[PDB]
From Swiss-Prot:
Gene that specifies this protein: rep
Domain Macro: 1-167
This protein's name: Papain-like protease nsp3
Described purpose of this protein according to its UniProt entry: Responsible for the cleavages located at the N-terminus of the replicase polyprotein. Participates together with nsp4 in the assembly of virally-induced cytoplasmic double-membrane vesicles necessary for viral replication. Antagonizes innate immune induction of type I interferon by blocking the phosphorylation, dimerization and subsequent nuclear translocation of host IRF3. Also prevents host NF-kappa-B signaling. In addition, PL-PRO possesses a deubiquitinating/deISGylating activity and processes both 'Lys-48'- and 'Lys-63'-linked polyubiquitin chains from cellular substrates.
Compartment(s) of residence: Host endoplasmic reticulum membrane
Activity regulation (record text): Inhibited in vitro by GRL-0617.
Organism expressing this protein natively: Severe acute respiratory syndrome coronavirus 2
Bilayer topology annotation: Multi-pass membrane protein
Reactions accelerated catalytically: Thiol-dependent hydrolysis of ester, thioester, amide, peptide and isopeptide bonds formed by the C-terminal Gly of ubiquitin (a 76-residue protein attached to proteins as an intracellular targeting signal)
Oligomeric form and interacting partners: May form homohexamers. Interacts with N protein.
Length: 167
């Protein structure tokens, strides 16, 4: 038993809810919250900027030190950093940004990072301002992630469409 509440069951291990991921992280304090990161860990906008804003920019400060030491991530890759006030850990995962011209085939590799964690709170990778179709992202998630993933969908109308179109 875990502390996630009101999630809709898609598969044995994947649940989904219409939720603001910042508010959800604050309430649950999950072991792992997933950030929709870019390779530079520049959290200007999107989920990245939203989670970073909720940490009072401490996520960005930690991230800049990480990049200065290690260099950029790979598209499809990830790193584990602090979850600050939102979670124990933040798994920064880089899904391909379609609007930047990046290769959408890399979405499966991005979701494979989730399998290194038993339970995660996460957004739909590559969706929103990353430019991929969210229906596709959900399909890749379900077909790739084997650990327990709680998907927080911000957009109410999208949430309804994702549930009603799920095979
Ligand atoms: C406080 N907060 C919370 C969330 N948020 C977002 C989420 C952005 N959309 C996505 O990640 C797309 C997958 C689809 C969705 O989940 O609706 N953008 N800005 C914020 C923000 O300020």
């Amino acid at each position: 038993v875990n502390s996630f509440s009101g999630y809709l069951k898609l598969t044995d291990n994947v649940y989904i809810k219409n939720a603001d991921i910042v508010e959800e992280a604050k309430k649950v304090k999950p072991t792992v919250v997933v950030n929709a990161a870019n390779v530079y860990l520049k959290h200007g906008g999107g989920v990245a900027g939203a989670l970073n804003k909720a940490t009072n920019n401490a996520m960005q400060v930690e991230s800049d030190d990480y990049i200065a030491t290690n260099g950029p991530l790979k598209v499809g890759g990830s790193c584990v950093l602090s979850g600050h006030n939102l979670a124990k850990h933040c798994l920064h995962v880089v899904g391909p940004n379609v609007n930047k011209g990046e290769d959408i085939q890399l979405l499966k590799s991005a979701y494979e990072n989730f399998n290194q964690h038993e339970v995660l709170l996460a957004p739909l990778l590559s969706a929103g301002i990353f430019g991929a179709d969210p229906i596709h992202s959900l399909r890749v998630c379900v077909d790739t992630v084997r650990t327990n993933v709680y998907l927080a969908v911000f957009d109410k109308n999208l949430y309804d469409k994702l549930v009603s179109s799920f095979l």
